[PDB]
Design a protein around this ligand. Structure first.
Ligand SMILES: C=CC1=C(C)/C(=C/C2=NC(=C\c3[nH]c(/C=C4\NC(=O)C(C)=C4C=C)c(C)c3CCC(=O)O)/C(CCC(=O)O)=C2C)NC1=O
Ligand SMILES: CC(C)CCC[C@@H](C)[C@H]1CC[C@H]2[C@@H]3CC=C4C[C@@H](O)CC[C@]4(C)[C@H]3CC[C@]12C
Length: 567
């Protein structure tokens, strides 16, 4: 399956990968052919020179100069085409991943973390794209410079080919192994240092608590001890690197001298001229380079298949709730009547603790009901059940005689709005956080964004801002100012049903007045449900309901329960 998926990924760029491979082949050929011609020139100059050998020098040099230009052109074309293919692949990977991620259900985001998703979107896509394109060329080059070398060595001198084939490979393998060991040691040291840095950051973050308890020196001593541990760890890597650099240089130096000694004692039929010896030396180096070049190809390919395996379950995942599909209703079909019957619910994160049990509730058109009840019971979950973020274990949530499980979730969400105690604002201009509630924000005229600023009592504090409505918030804003901005979105949305969530703690005197006036027109001429924390709006509510033990224990008007004998 992995091979088929990789071929599918590479399919759109075949006409460009084929050309890249074709140019690579010629570049590699010309670069493995060069040493033969260099040896020919050297033998022309120094091996039994004739009376007039200058002409041949010029001719051969001109030929090689002509060849090198073509080689360079092929190399450049390969580089360009190989580097562009990977970018073209990674763009598509990034777009597809993001599109797949942004259409899941909310439970998936509850169990999963954002850091993992961001890491997969930032690094896995790069590794998978680079493994196929920018690594295949390196592997092909390494395989091309390891096969021609042996063939040429046996063509030139069979006697010295056997001797050289019994030295280099062992050294290269030992070097690669050692290097892996060094990498392991470095990783261990870095892990220890990261632990120390995390402790420092944690203790720096909370300084008031540290000073309150007279604990400023113990942290210093602990950090010092952690630093000594890190240094003791690093000494070993220092020793290992010293060994590597002491051994590899000697191994490299002794290889060149052995070939000269061996090829200088060969007399008779097995006699080599200077150019032949130079060619032999060049080919031996090339083979030695090739082995190390080949190892990295396998390493990077394995990492790339790992990254691809990590990526290839998010794209093929299937959402558990329907998105953008269902039925739609006319203008008069809905009057705003919401009916809840026998609802059972429990957060997926902690199924143990139940929240709603035998929940029945009716809200007629044009009626302001208040769900006043004990605090901390999580009655806010009703908002997440009307919007269709979750589903109940057992029950029905019907709107005008139809279960919301058959309605289009995107169309339903438009007709139901909300205002929160702590509105969440994006990193954008103030005007860009008010047009988010319109159907087409890209076609909103500033005439409108001005009308709702006065209605929401926002045009007062905005004017003080030097940039007016272009101020970027994410710029600090007051708690009471965030509210008045939120009502700006609600006014522009123009919902037919409103869900509200009041703040447990009263705001400032200035905010307690401006905010209240704005909400008066947001509760005018619409069906509204108020989850209140204080008895301020309880009297004005048309009806009131008390939620006890996740149930509608009592149902009565403001004076119905107050006038009862048990009071
Ligand atoms: C067997 C593989 C093999 C590997 C992977 C290897 C690794 C290293 N070679 C180094 C230097 C040299 N390399 C060569 C020639 C070959 N390089 C090769 O890859 C093959 C195959 C050769 C001989 C044909 C020579 C003449 C020198 C001395 C040049 C100088 O003075 O530096 C250094 C740096 C040394 C420092 O300076 O600390 C390191 C880490 N050594 C090997 O033999
Ligand atoms: C006759 C030939 C084979 C002798 C070798 C001469 C050339 C090819 C030598 C001279 C210096 C050498 C380099 C010096 C040190 C390093 C750093 C090491 O991390 C990789 C190998 C590398 C890059 C060596 C590769 C080969 C090298 C470039």
């Amino acid at each position: 399956p992995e091979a088929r998926k990789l071929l599918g990924l590479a399919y759109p760029e075949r006409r460009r990968l084929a050309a890249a491979v074709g140019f690579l082949t010629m570049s590699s050929v010309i670069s493995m052919s060069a040493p033969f011609f260099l040896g020919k020139i050297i033998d022309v100059i120094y091996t039994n020179p004739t009376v007039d050998y200058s002409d041949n020098l010029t001719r051969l040099c001109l030929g090689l100069s002509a060849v090198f230009l073509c080689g360079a052109a092929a190399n450049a074309i390969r580089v360009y085409l190989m580097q562009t293919s990977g970018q073209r692949i990674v763009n598509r990977l990034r777009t597809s991943l993001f599109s797949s991620i942004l259409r899941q259900e909310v439970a998936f985001f509850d169990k999963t973390r954002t850091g993992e998703l961001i890491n997969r979107l930032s690094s896995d896509t790069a590794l998978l794209g680079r493994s196929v394109t920018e690594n295949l060329s390196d592997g092909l080059r390494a395989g091309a410079q390891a096969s021609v070398g042996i063939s040429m060595m046996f063509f030139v001198s069979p006697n010295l080919a056997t001797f050289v084939l019994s030295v280099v490979p062992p050294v290269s393998i030992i070097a690669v192994i050692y290097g892996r060991y060094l990498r392991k040691l470095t990783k261990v040291t870095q892990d220890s240092l990261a632990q120390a840095t995390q402790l420092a950051e944690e203790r720096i973050g909370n300084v008031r608590t540290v000073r309150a308890f007279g604990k400023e020196m113990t942290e210093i001593e602990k950090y010092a001890s952690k630093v000594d541990h890190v240094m003791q760890l690093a000494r070993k890597e220092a020793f290992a690197r010293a060994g590597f650099f002491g051994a590899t240089g000697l191994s490299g130096n002794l290889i060149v001298l052995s070939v000269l000694y061996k090829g200088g004692l060969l007399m008779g039929s097995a006699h080599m001229t200077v150019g032949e010896l130079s060619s032999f030396l060049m080919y031996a180096f090339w083979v030695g380079i090739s082995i190390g070049g080949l190892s990295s190809f396998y390493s990077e390919l394995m990492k790339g298949l790992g990254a691809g395996g990590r990526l290839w379950e998010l794209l093929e995942r299937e959402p558990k709730l329907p998105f953008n599909e269902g039925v739609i209703l006319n203008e008069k079909s809905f009057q705003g009547a919401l009916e809840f019957k026998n609802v059972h619910f429990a957060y997926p994160a902690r199924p143990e603790v139940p929240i709603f049990q035998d929940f029945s509730l009716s809200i007629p058109s044009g009626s302001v009901t208040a769900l006043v009840g004990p605090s901390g019971s999580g009655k806010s979950t009703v908002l997440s059940l009307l919007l269709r973020l979750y589903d109940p274990a057992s029950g029905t949530i019907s709107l005008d005689g139809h279960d919301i499980r058959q309605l289009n979730p995107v169309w339903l969400r438009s007709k139901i709005g909300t205002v929160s105690q702590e509105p969440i604002l994006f990193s954008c201009s103030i005007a860009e956080n008010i047009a988010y509630g319109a159907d087409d924000p890209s076609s909103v005229t500033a005439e409108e964004i001005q009308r709702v600023a006065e209605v929401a009592n926002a045009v007062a504090f905005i004017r003080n801002f030097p940039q007016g409505f272009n101020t970027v918030v994410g710029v600090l804003l007051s708690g009471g100012q965030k509210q008045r901005i939120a009502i700006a979105r609600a006014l522009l949305k123009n919902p037919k049903i409103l869900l509200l969530d009041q703040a447990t703690s009263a705001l400032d005197a200035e905010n307690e007045y401006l905010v209240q006036e704005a909400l008066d027109r947001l509760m005018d001429g619409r069906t509204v449900l108020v989850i209140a924390h204080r008895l301020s709006t309880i009297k004005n509510a048309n009806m009131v309901a008390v939620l006890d033990q996740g149930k509608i224990t009592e149902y009565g008007k403001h004076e119905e329960l107050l006038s009862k004998p048990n009071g």
